[PDB]
């Protein structure tokens, strides 16, 4: 079985490279952040432009939804994170304390905490209600490329250009495990599988790997794409067939069979690097987004 994703919509409106796209957990909306300092909200099913959210002084590298779909957090080159009320577009809180560009961010499942990663090589945990920093983890010795909570928020996984993935106990701040692999290629993205048992990690040697967290073992490798320069988001697609989805520096979206590691589709249509992909939580829908020469988001639909 292979998917048959086909282009349904192209979404335009950002005036610089798009950095990140995410579907709201309730399936209604797509949020996009951009080097143009703006967040935009789009209808998930029709691509209809809904609204622009502004306030960052410099470009945004990541955006993420709270679990009730009511809040967003954005990570900006202005060295802050901002928490936004989606329906009003208002900035509720500005999270200050990183001493360099903020690159990546995520809510925990309860959405009372935000985790962030920065070029200052640290990971920070923030209280959503007050906006205060709760913990700083001296997590890495290079920029932190990705941070992600597991399914019940008890663990954080962080990745870095230093070649490490590290799993942290959220509450105690203690590093429980470090994944190290051979020649230490920079790690550009990382995230837990939906069941919390595996970690998908992208490295800047054109490689994606699926690790068993408990055993510290690489179980699967996925190749064929180009990824040497950018921190490209990758996903587990679970609504239909079990795929791995990623962008690529050859302007294609790659879809792999998770178990066999075979490439099952390449989505063509972007005209610059596909920096970001997202999978819809209930439909077989992929959103993809691309850099300066393109600046658009594409929505793709499959029957499986």
């Amino acid at each position: 079985v292979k998917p048959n994703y086909a282009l349904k919509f192209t979404l335009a409106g950002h005036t610089k490279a798009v950095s990140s796209v995410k579907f709201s957990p309730n399936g209604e909306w797509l949020a996009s952040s951009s080097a143009d300092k703006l967040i935009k909200i789009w209808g998930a099913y029709d691509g209809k432009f809904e609204k622009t959210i502004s306030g960052h002084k410099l470009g945004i590298s990541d955006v993420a939804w709270s679990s009730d779909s009511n809040l967003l957090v954005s990570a900006s080159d202005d060295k802050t994170l901002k928490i936004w009320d989606v329906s009003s577009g208002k900035c509720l809180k500005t999270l200050k304390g990183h001493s360099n560009y903020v690159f990546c961010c995520n809510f925990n499942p309860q959405s009372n905490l935000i985790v962030s990663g920065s070029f200052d090589e640290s990971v920070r945990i923030w209280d959503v209600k007050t906006g205060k920093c709760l913990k700083t983890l001296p997590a890495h010795s290079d920029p932190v490329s990705a941070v992600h909570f597991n399914r019940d928020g008890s663990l954080i996984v962080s990745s870095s250009y230093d070649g490490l993935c590290r799993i942290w106990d959220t509450a105690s701040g203690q590093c429980l495990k470090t994944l190290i692999d051979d020649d230490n290629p920079p790690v550009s993205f990382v995230k837990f599988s939906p069941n919390g048992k595996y970690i998908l990690a992208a490295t800047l040697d054109n490689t994606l790997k699926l690790w068993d967290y408990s055993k510290g073992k690489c179980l699967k490798t996925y190749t064929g794409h180009k990824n040497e320069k950018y921190c490209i988001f990758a996903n587990f697609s679970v609504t239909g067939g079990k795929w791995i989805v990623s962008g690529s520096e050859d302007n294609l979206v790659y879809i792999w069979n998770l178990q066999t590691k075979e490439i099952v589709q390449k989505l063509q249509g972007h005209t610059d690097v596909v920096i970001s992909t997202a999978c819809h939580p209930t439909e077989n829908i992929i959103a993809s987004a691309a850099l300066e020469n393109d600046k658009t988001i594409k929505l793709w639909k499959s029957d499986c």
Binding site: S20, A35, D77, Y230
Partner: peptide, 8 residues
């Protein structure tokens, strides 16, 4: 300008 959208 965003660090994610610039090459490493």
């Amino acid at each position: 300008g965003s660090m994610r959208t610039e090459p490493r």
